[PDB]
Amino acid sequence: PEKTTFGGLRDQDRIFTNIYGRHDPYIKGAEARGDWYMTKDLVGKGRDWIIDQIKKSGLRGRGGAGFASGLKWSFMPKVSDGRPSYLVVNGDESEPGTCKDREIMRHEPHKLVEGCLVAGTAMGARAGYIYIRGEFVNERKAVERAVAEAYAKGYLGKNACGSGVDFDLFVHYGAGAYICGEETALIESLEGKQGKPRLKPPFPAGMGLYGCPTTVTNVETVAVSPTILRRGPEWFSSFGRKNNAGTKLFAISGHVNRPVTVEEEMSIPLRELIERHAGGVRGGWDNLLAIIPGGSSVPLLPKKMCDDVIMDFDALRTAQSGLGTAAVIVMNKDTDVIDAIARLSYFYKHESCGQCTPCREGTGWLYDIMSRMRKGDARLEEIDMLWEITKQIEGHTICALGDAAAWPVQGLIRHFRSEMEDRIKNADQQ
Amino acid sequence: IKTSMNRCIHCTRCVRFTHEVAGTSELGITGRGRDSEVGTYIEKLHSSELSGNVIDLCPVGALLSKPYAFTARSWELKGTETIDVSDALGSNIKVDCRGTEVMRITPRLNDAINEEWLSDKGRFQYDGLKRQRLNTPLVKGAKGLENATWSAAFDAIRTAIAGAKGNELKAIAGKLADAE
Numbered sequence: 001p002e003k004t005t006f007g008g009l010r011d012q013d014r015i016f017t018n019i020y021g022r023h024d025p026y027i028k029g030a031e032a033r034g035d036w037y038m039t040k041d042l043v044g045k046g047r048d049w050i051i052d053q054i055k056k057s058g059l060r061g062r063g064g065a066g067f068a069s070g071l072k073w074s075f076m077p078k079v080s081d082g083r084p085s086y087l088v089v090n091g092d093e094s095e096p097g098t099c100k101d102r103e104i105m106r107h108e109p110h111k112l113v114e115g116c117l118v119a120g121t122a123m124g125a126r127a128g129y130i131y132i133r134g135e136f137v138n139e140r141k142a143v144e145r146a147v148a149e150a151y152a153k154g155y156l157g158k159n160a161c162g163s164g165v166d167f168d169l170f171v172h173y174g175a176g177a178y179i180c181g182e183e184t185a186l187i188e189s190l191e192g193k194q195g196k197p198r199l200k201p202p203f204p205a206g207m208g209l210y211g212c213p214t215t216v217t218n219v220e221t222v223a224v225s226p227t228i229l230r231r232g233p234e235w236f237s238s239f240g241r242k243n244n245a246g247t248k249l250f251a252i253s254g255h256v257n258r259p260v261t262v263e264e265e266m267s268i269p270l271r272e273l274i275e276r277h278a279g280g281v282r283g284g285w286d287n288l289l290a291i292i293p294g295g296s297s298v299p300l301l302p303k304k305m306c307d308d309v310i311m312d313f314d315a316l317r318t319a320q321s322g323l324g325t326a327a328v329i330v331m332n333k334d335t336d337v338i339d340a341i342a343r344l345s346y347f348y349k350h351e352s353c354g355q356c357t358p359c360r361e362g363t364g365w366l367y368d369i370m371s372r373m374r375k376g377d378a379r380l381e382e383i384d385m386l387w388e389i390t391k392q393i394e395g396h397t398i399c400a401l402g403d404a405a406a407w408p409v410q411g412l413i414r415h416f417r418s419e420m421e422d423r424i425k426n427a428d429q430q
Numbered sequence: 431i432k433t434s435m436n437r438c439i440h441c442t443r444c445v446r447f448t449h450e451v452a453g454t455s456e457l458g459i460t461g462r463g464r465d466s467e468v469g470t471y472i473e474k475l476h477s478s479e480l481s482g483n484v485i486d487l488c489p490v491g492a493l494l495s496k497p498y499a500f501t502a503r504s505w506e507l508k509g510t511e512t513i514d515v516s517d518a519l520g521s522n523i524k525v526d527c528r529g530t531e532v533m534r535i536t537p538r539l540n541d542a543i544n545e546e547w548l549s550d551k552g553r554f555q556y557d558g559l560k561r562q563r564l565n566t567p568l569v570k571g572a573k574g575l576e577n578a579t580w581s582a583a584f585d586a587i588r589t590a591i592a593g594a595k596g597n598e599l600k601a602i603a604g605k606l607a608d609a610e
């Protein structure tokens with residue numbers, strides 16, 4: 001927590017404690033680990049107190065946005081106009097680099113349910129829906145068992161946990177779509193239509209599920225909120241830097257000696273994270289071509305930037321990237337960056353819903369151009385054209401999947417233009 | 431309705447019309463991403479009598495009029511603004527003609543009566559304006575109805591009316607008779 005240096009989180013400071021499933025993930029173990037401890041008191045203290053405590057903690061939103069959780073929760077209507085309020089937890093975790101939410105759902109089901117109760121009380125939501133990926137059948141079974149147990153002991157329902165508050169929780173599951181993780185597309189999917197995002201000028205707080213005020217929040221934020229109210233906002237604020245306070249779950253994947261999911265305070269150096277928890281890059285730190293810091297949506301960073309880069313939101317913004325999700329992907333010198341970025345372009349071509357013209361057409365265009373560059377078929381001017389197309393897509397789409405499709409290609413052009421030129425020239429030369 | 435779905439830009443005008451206005455709810459965008467397609471997933475035929483309006487609503491010719499197919503171009507046609515006698519709504523229409531032939535009929539804007547919509551009968555009944563037409567006066571004889579001049583037919587009508595008197599003369603007006 002020291003302002004000079006951050007890292008080396010201790011076990012006493014970790015929110016997610018059975019993250020590795022060494023213990024009973026269900027209610028017996030959960031009560032013994034500090035779950036559902038004094039939920040009566042925290043909920044009874046009123047929605048205003050919870051909102052102010054979350055605001056003081058500095059908790060930004062996990063899931064990619066990074067938007068302050070307290071302000072978003074405070075946007076919810078205070079008094080009913082005849083329309084109920086809903087809490088929807090985005091447990092859809094489709095993202096090419098992120099595995100972190102699945103461990104929480106399968107090994108800490110009860111923390112998520114307690115967080116749903118706390119946040120629904122904070123936003124005055126009568127009912128709650130936990131959206132889960134359809135592929136996560138077993139994780140959904142774990143969450144459903146947790147919900148049933150909480151209902152059985154009266155932790156949920158009318159007079160939930162003994163406080164004069166009423167909250168009902170449901171578990172809903174999709175059929176597989178990366179777009180259904182977006183706030184409006186998730187609402188459309190749960191309503192019963194195709195998961196196509198809604199134009200934002202109507203905002204979900206104003207009109208959401210069934211036309212009623214709703215808030216969509218990630219599993220990790222909902223899970224961290226109850227212990228923030230228990231442990232204290234100052235404890236949460238101490239660990240990270242300014243504006244970036246809390247601990248976050250980092251999922252190291254790729255060419256590392258040990259791929260691990262771990263909890264660490266934010267503002268750890270990326271080199272420190274990879275070397276201590278992941279065991280170092282396969283073949284040593286010398287053996288680095290690039291690192292994708294925040295899952296596949298954000299632009300990649302070259303080794304040189306990875307030397308001094310710090311695992312934070314604003315700093316990765318300064319490094320022309322972002323910590324959307326703590327899904328760090330490591331590539332060796334052996335790796336062909338062109339082919340991996342082309343596979344990400346194919347991913348985005350497959351995951352576009354097709355609603356708006358720029359995403360639906362330009363993402364397939366991007367995939368075709370990246371495929372030609374993977375073989376050297378293209379010309380040297382094709383790279384500049386590719387940058388222009390990425391600029392054409394960005395900002396002119398309904399949701400951010402166009403931006404998430406444009407960014408990896410832009411990062412490849414920006415930091416690894418030399419290799420593309422090499423491949424194009426050599427194919428012509430040979 | 432003729433279909434060229436390759437020309438289809440994925441607006442949702444046909445689906446929104448079929449749902450909100452026509453109310454048959456037959457068309458939808460099936461698929462995700464670039465291979466998303468518009469139309470009935472099953473082989474179905476559009477049942478509404480307002481079906482012709484999707485053709486006008488279609489901006490990019492993916493939905494086109496099968497009766498008016500490959501027959502003319504837009505610049506070749508002279509448009510005259512008239513009304514539809516198909517029913518008592520009096521839908522305001524624009525009749526496009528090449529020479530002495532009516533080529534197509536399309537609606538006009540009149541928020542009072544027909545917002546901008548036309549029924550299928552009115553839109554596609556111009557085909558029956560070229561068939562079974564009466565061109566000359568006909569007077570009956572032992573050989574049947576035969577060609578006659580206007581004077582001879584009027585003479586026969588005069589000889590017939592001379593016999594009848596008062597209520598023996600009877601008039602029946604049709605569906606398409608005009609005020610004058």
Ligand SMILES: Cc1cc2nc3c(=O)[nH]c(=O)nc-3n(C[C@H](O)[C@H](O)[C@H](O)COP(=O)(O)O)c2cc1C
Pocket residue numbers: 060061062063064065066067069072090091092093094095178179180181182183216217218219221399400401404
């Ligand atoms: C294409 C797309 C996919 C997304 N997928 C997810 C996802 O799988 N999980 C998630 O938590 N957020 C996802 N998001 C971000 C959503 O906005 C999310 O519901 C919201 O940011 C949660 O807000 P929070 O940060 O306060 O938790 C996605 C966004 C977009 C544009």
Ligand code: SF4
Pocket residue numbers: 179196197351352353354355356357358359360397398399400401402
């Ligand atoms: S950007 Fe892509 S995924 Fe998002 S609404 Fe447009 S077409 Fe659909």
Ligand code: SF4
Pocket residue numbers: 437438439440441442443444445468487488489490491492493
């Ligand atoms: S109105 Fe025409 S262009 Fe639009 S979706 Fe229907 S067929 Fe395609």
